[PDB]
Scaffold this active site. Structure first.
Site, mmCIF file in Angstrom:
data_model
loop_
_atom_site.group_PDB
_atom_site.id
_atom_site.type_symbol
_atom_site.label_atom_id
_atom_site.label_comp_id
_atom_site.label_asym_id
_atom_site.label_seq_id
_atom_site.Cartn_x
_atom_site.Cartn_y
_atom_site.Cartn_z
ATOM 1 N N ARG A 37 0.782 -1.225 0.000
ATOM 2 C CA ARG A 37 0.000 0.000 0.000
ATOM 3 C C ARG A 37 0.839 1.314 0.000
ATOM 4 O O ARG A 37 0.634 2.177 -0.882
ATOM 5 C CB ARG A 37 -1.047 0.000 1.146
ATOM 6 C CG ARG A 37 -2.040 1.160 1.076
ATOM 7 C CD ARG A 37 -3.029 1.210 2.227
ATOM 8 N NE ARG A 37 -3.745 2.502 2.235
ATOM 9 C CZ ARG A 37 -4.049 3.192 3.341
ATOM 10 N NH1 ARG A 37 -3.766 2.709 4.544
ATOM 11 N NH2 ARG A 37 -4.679 4.353 3.258
ATOM 12 N N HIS A 41 0.223 3.032 -3.520
ATOM 13 C CA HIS A 41 -0.702 4.147 -3.322
ATOM 14 C C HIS A 41 0.058 5.456 -3.471
ATOM 15 O O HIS A 41 -0.460 6.372 -4.138
ATOM 16 C CB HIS A 41 -1.436 4.073 -1.980
ATOM 17 C CG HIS A 41 -2.645 3.193 -1.990
ATOM 18 N ND1 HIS A 41 -3.797 3.516 -1.307
ATOM 19 C CD2 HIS A 41 -2.885 1.992 -2.579
ATOM 20 C CE1 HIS A 41 -4.695 2.553 -1.473
ATOM 21 N NE2 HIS A 41 -4.171 1.618 -2.240
ATOM 22 N N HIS A 162 -4.535 -6.156 -4.155
ATOM 23 C CA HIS A 162 -5.511 -6.387 -3.090
ATOM 24 C C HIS A 162 -5.677 -7.852 -2.684
ATOM 25 O O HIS A 162 -6.439 -8.154 -1.778
ATOM 26 C CB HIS A 162 -6.880 -5.794 -3.437
ATOM 27 C CG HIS A 162 -6.902 -4.296 -3.438
ATOM 28 N ND1 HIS A 162 -7.930 -3.561 -3.986
ATOM 29 C CD2 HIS A 162 -6.004 -3.397 -2.972
ATOM 30 C CE1 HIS A 162 -7.668 -2.271 -3.848
ATOM 31 N NE2 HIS A 162 -6.492 -2.146 -3.256
ATOM 32 N N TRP A 178 -9.719 -9.013 1.177
ATOM 33 C CA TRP A 178 -10.298 -9.361 -0.106
ATOM 34 C C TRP A 178 -10.265 -10.880 -0.279
ATOM 35 O O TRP A 178 -11.051 -11.462 -1.027
ATOM 36 C CB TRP A 178 -9.521 -8.693 -1.242
ATOM 37 C CG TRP A 178 -9.735 -7.219 -1.381
ATOM 38 C CD1 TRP A 178 -10.606 -6.605 -2.221
ATOM 39 C CD2 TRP A 178 -9.074 -6.169 -0.647
ATOM 40 N NE1 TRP A 178 -10.537 -5.247 -2.063
ATOM 41 C CE2 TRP A 178 -9.613 -4.948 -1.098
ATOM 42 C CE3 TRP A 178 -8.090 -6.144 0.350
ATOM 43 C CZ2 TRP A 178 -9.192 -3.700 -0.589
ATOM 44 C CZ3 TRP A 178 -7.670 -4.919 0.849
ATOM 45 C CH2 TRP A 178 -8.223 -3.706 0.372
ATOM 46 N N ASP A 207 -13.112 -2.469 -7.166
ATOM 47 C CA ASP A 207 -12.908 -3.876 -7.515
ATOM 48 C C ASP A 207 -14.024 -4.371 -8.433
ATOM 49 O O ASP A 207 -13.732 -4.933 -9.509
ATOM 50 C CB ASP A 207 -12.758 -4.776 -6.285
ATOM 51 C CG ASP A 207 -11.679 -4.292 -5.335
ATOM 52 O OD1 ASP A 207 -10.537 -4.002 -5.782
ATOM 53 O OD2 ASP A 207 -11.969 -4.182 -4.135
HETATM 54 C C1 HEM Z 1 -7.243 0.456 -8.217
HETATM 55 C C2 HEM Z 1 -7.396 1.538 -7.465
HETATM 56 C C3 HEM Z 1 -7.243 1.335 -5.944
HETATM 57 C C4 HEM Z 1 -8.161 1.632 -5.029
HETATM 58 C C5 HEM Z 1 -9.537 2.259 -5.249
HETATM 59 C C6 HEM Z 1 -7.621 1.254 -3.747
HETATM 60 C C7 HEM Z 1 -8.267 1.391 -2.558
HETATM 61 C C8 HEM Z 1 -7.849 0.826 -1.388
HETATM 62 C C9 HEM Z 1 -8.480 1.040 -0.125
HETATM 63 C C10 HEM Z 1 -9.734 1.949 0.021
HETATM 64 C C11 HEM Z 1 -7.781 0.314 0.794
HETATM 65 C C12 HEM Z 1 -8.071 0.177 2.291
HETATM 66 C C13 HEM Z 1 -7.323 1.148 3.199
HETATM 67 C C14 HEM Z 1 -7.682 0.670 4.594
HETATM 68 O O1 HEM Z 1 -8.859 0.832 4.997
HETATM 69 O O2 HEM Z 1 -6.799 0.093 5.311
HETATM 70 C C15 HEM Z 1 -6.698 -0.376 0.112
HETATM 71 C C16 HEM Z 1 -5.744 -1.228 0.670
HETATM 72 C C17 HEM Z 1 -4.683 -1.849 0.049
HETATM 73 N N1 HEM Z 1 -4.178 -1.569 -1.232
HETATM 74 FE FE1 HEM Z 1 -5.298 -0.435 -2.639
HETATM 75 N N2 HEM Z 1 -6.365 0.694 -3.937
HETATM 76 C C18 HEM Z 1 -6.076 0.747 -5.283
HETATM 77 C C19 HEM Z 1 -4.892 0.337 -5.875
HETATM 78 C C20 HEM Z 1 -3.876 -0.402 -5.315
HETATM 79 C C21 HEM Z 1 -2.646 -0.799 -5.964
HETATM 80 C C22 HEM Z 1 -2.249 -0.361 -7.402
HETATM 81 C C23 HEM Z 1 -1.946 -1.563 -5.073
HETATM 82 C C24 HEM Z 1 -0.578 -2.269 -5.222
HETATM 83 C C25 HEM Z 1 -0.385 -3.019 -6.323
HETATM 84 C C26 HEM Z 1 -2.731 -1.669 -3.867
HETATM 85 C C27 HEM Z 1 -2.370 -2.372 -2.730
HETATM 86 C C28 HEM Z 1 -3.084 -2.393 -1.540
HETATM 87 C C29 HEM Z 1 -2.826 -3.275 -0.412
HETATM 88 C C30 HEM Z 1 -1.698 -4.332 -0.300
HETATM 89 C C31 HEM Z 1 -3.886 -2.900 0.643
HETATM 90 C C32 HEM Z 1 -4.096 -3.483 2.052
HETATM 91 C C33 HEM Z 1 -3.327 -2.647 3.077
HETATM 92 C C34 HEM Z 1 -3.462 -3.236 4.481
HETATM 93 O O3 HEM Z 1 -3.657 -4.456 4.645
HETATM 94 O O4 HEM Z 1 -3.387 -2.497 5.483
HETATM 95 N N3 HEM Z 1 -3.892 -0.948 -4.050
HETATM 96 N N4 HEM Z 1 -6.770 -0.020 -1.221
#
Ligand code: HEM
Ligand code: NA
Length: 248
Positions: A37, A41, A162, A178, A207
């Site tokens: 993230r 991000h 995700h 997820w 998603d």
């Molecule tokens: C496609 C557009 C994306 C959206 C709308 C999005 C949105 C989100 C949101 C809303 C969260 C949750 C934050 C939380 O409540 O802890 C999240 C978590 C996460 N994102 Fe994304 N994200 C996107 C793209 C990406 C990309 C490109 C990556 C890396 C390749 C990524 C990797 C992650 C990971 C690993 C988590 C989990 C973090 C944790 O476990 O604390 N995301 N994302």
């Protein structure tokens, strides 16, 4: 279209040693998803037209951490500070992309190529460039395509990031993993997307947008069927993301 800069042998030595220490630290702390993230991000603030934002360590700045979409990323930055202090020669920019690369590796993902040389930039980009979890395919294309300069293939493959981790109600407001294996990098994110909403698991509206788009939908189907093809496309997309605005 990349021309990577020259770094000194001592710089390269610090990258190798940092990479190993990051593997141990991230494995032990169970924070691969938060680290992924942070890297991904934060790279996603890149706007190609103006060549502003992107993976340049501005996410360390209390001003960028304060952006509501970055809730919880201060934890990530705080976690990495002691290790970073062991490698003063490395830019924060490189260190955070390295942590992202390592996060994918230690969870069982592909080996994403990494090139050193990002420089730490003085000014964070404006708030609001990040992908919005409530919006759909048009928004995804605006952000990843129009601003970042990534492809439709990149969009779907990167959404698969995700496959590790969870949302938290106190961070985004969304809640839960997820997949059933949130510390394992594999193609289950796409498998779960296809099978509908299973109790206990999360799908963001972002998603779900992948399923209804004529271009995105074949990619979701390909990755659900073929984890190797996911791993290939993913390694390609993540490298590009980590490299936005860097070496061209
Ligand atoms: C496609 C557009 C994306 C959206 C709308 C999005 C949105 C989100 C949101 C809303 C969260 C949750 C934050 C939380 O409540 O802890 C999240 C978590 C996460 N994102 Fe994304 N994200 C996107 C793209 C990406 C990309 C490109 C990556 C890396 C390749 C990524 C990797 C992650 C990971 C690993 C988590 C989990 C973090 C944790 O476990 O604390 N995301 N994302
Ligand atoms: Na998984």
């Amino acid at each position: 279209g990349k021309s990577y800069p020259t770094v000194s042998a001592d710089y390269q030595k610090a990258v190798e040693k940092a990479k190993k220490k990051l593997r141990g630290f991230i494995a032990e702390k169970r924070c691969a998803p938060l680290m992924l993230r942070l890297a991904a991000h934060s790279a996603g603030t890149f706007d190609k037209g103006t060549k502003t934002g992107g993976p340049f360590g501005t996410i360390k700045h209390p001003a960028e951490l304060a952006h509501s979409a970055n809730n919880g990323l201060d934890i990530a930055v705080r976690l990495l500070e002691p290790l970073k202090a062991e490698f003063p020669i490395l830019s924060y920019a490189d260190f955070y992309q390295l942590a992202g690369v390592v996060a994918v590796e230690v969870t069982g993902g592909p080996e994403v190529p990494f090139h050193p040389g990002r420089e730490d930039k003085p000014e964070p980009p404006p708030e609001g460039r990040l992908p919005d979890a409530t919006k759909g395919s048009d928004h995804l294309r605006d952000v990843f395509g129009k601003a970042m300069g990534l492809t439709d293939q990149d969009i779907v493959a990167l959404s698969g990031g995700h496959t590790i981790g969870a949302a938290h109600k106190e961070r985004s407001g969304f809640e839960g993993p997820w997949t059933s294996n949130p510390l394992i990098f594999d193609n289950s994110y796409f498998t779960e997307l296809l099978s509908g909403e299973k109790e206990g698991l999360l799908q963001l509206p972002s998603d779900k947008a992948l399923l209804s788009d004529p271009v995105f939908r074949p990619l979701v189907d390909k990755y659900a069927a073929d984890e190797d093809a996911f791993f290939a496309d993913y390694a390609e997309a993540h490298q590009k993301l980590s490299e936005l605005g860097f070496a061209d």
